[model samples]
Target: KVFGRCELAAAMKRHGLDNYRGYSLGNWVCAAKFESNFNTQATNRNTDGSTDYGILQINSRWWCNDGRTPGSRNLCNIPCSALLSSDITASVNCAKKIVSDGNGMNAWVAWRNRCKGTDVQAWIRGCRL
Candidate 1:
């Protein structure tokens, strides 16, 4: 499922990401836009043999178990396939873990490359969330 910008903003807020680790809802929304374009089913296979899953693009190398990525830690204790579902509960939960365990929003390359140091309010503007 592809989330509309405002819808994704509201969803993130509902999942407690509004200020999680000091990242605003707009920051998360913007990162998701660049990471997966709000597509819940998104997946990318890395050159290192790890796969990134879902809108937040959580990686299999350390976050999820895909039964393929070598040296997977599965720190999130979730199956990579769970992140692909439109429900996004597992994805959101794992995202929180990623932020808390790592370098906040910097855990995602997309966020560092795009959302970081940007005026993210545009990502959630006029959304009324």
Candidate 2:
């Protein structure tokens, strides 16, 4: 796993996603916590034959590449591989664009189930941030 709870909690804390739009930074991180287990390289080929790519599991058809590989709609105007990298800057930046563009957190199933209705503060429980 690229991040195991505390690891991303701290990484996100440093990422400074506050006031990006629609949801809290912690909420974003929480969704990612369950969505891809924080693995930037994570990809899940869905029943529809589309893939959910990178840390946020961005949909290939709607957001990233459309063809087998390397091809992209590139809604965020970034390489799909960029999101899969350890840097996370592109992933997090795209995430902000995802929300500010009005796509909403509903795109991520994890946000509805596990990211909300909880303290959310727990995401930063032990962080030095």
Candidate 3:
């Protein structure tokens, strides 16, 4: 599912991502934009042989069990495929767990290079979320 900017905002908010772990809705929206372009089916492979799955790009290294990443902790205890679902509910929940586990939003390089420390209010501006 490719979500419009505002649509993703509402969806994230509906799933409790608004300020979850102290990251604002705009931050999540911006990260999603850079991470997956709001596309739920997005996937990326890392040099470490791990893959990032879903909109937020939860990693197979420590988050989900893809059965491919060696030494994966599967901290979220979910299949990596679950993150690719269009619903995004599980993705959002796993996102919260990532932060709760002390990684924070900087877990994604997209957030670090693009969204972090930027005035991301524009990501949600004019959105009726």
Candidate 4:
């Protein structure tokens, strides 16, 4: 269930993420796990009634402005919801672009660092598809 929906396989293929052995999926999964639990429809709220919706925990108020319309938030760029729409491959690819661009996976790195000294490989092997 979680593996099928999370689509880590397709995501890895799309993003060229092949460092599970040397690096770790701990960091990658941590943010996704924390933000959406791998749920595609996950959404949260802000104090101003605006929203931080979908995977990547994108706050529609900030990054949403790049390619979205005036009233509509579905820009050609990449919407958080789009990534969360059970399209794990696309979501991972999108995340890769962000990380490659500049948004370093700090959240993921933090998760990895914290989980260090533990049997991280075995942990990922259990979760990986």
lDDT for each candidate structure: 0.91, 0.73, 0.90, 0.52
Q: What TM-score does prediction 3 earn? A: 0.96
Q: Which pairs clash in the backbone of model 1?
A: none
lDDT of 4 by residue, 35-65 (tens): 6666667767666555655555665554443
State in Å the error of residue 129, model 4.
6.2
Ranking by TM-score: 1, 3, 2, 4
Regions more than 4 Å wrong, model 3: none
Location of the lowest summed lDDT over 10 successive residues in candidate 1: 101-110
**Which residue pairs show collisions in model 3?**
none
lDDT for position 44 in model 2: 88
Ranking by lDDT: 1, 3, 2, 4
TM-score of each: 0.97, 0.83, 0.96, 0.57
- Angstrom error at residue 54, model 1: 0.2
Candidate 1 residue-wise lDDT at 64: 89
* lDDT computed for candidate 3: 0.90
Between prediction 1 and prediction 2, which has the larger TM-score? 1
lDDT of 1 by residue, 1-129 (tens): 999999989988998889988888889999999999999999999999999999989999998899998777999998999999988789999999889985888888889988899899988889985
- State which candidate has the highest TM-score: 1
> What are the RMSDs of all candidates, in order?
0.8, 2.6, 0.9, 5.1
> Candidate 2: where are CA atoms >4 Å away?
69-72
For residues 1-129, what per-residue lDDT tens digits would candidate 2 score against the true structure?
487666776666567675466466678778887888889889888776777878888877667664664444668776566778887777777777676665577667788788768878777667665
What lDDT score is found at residue 41 in candidate 3? 98
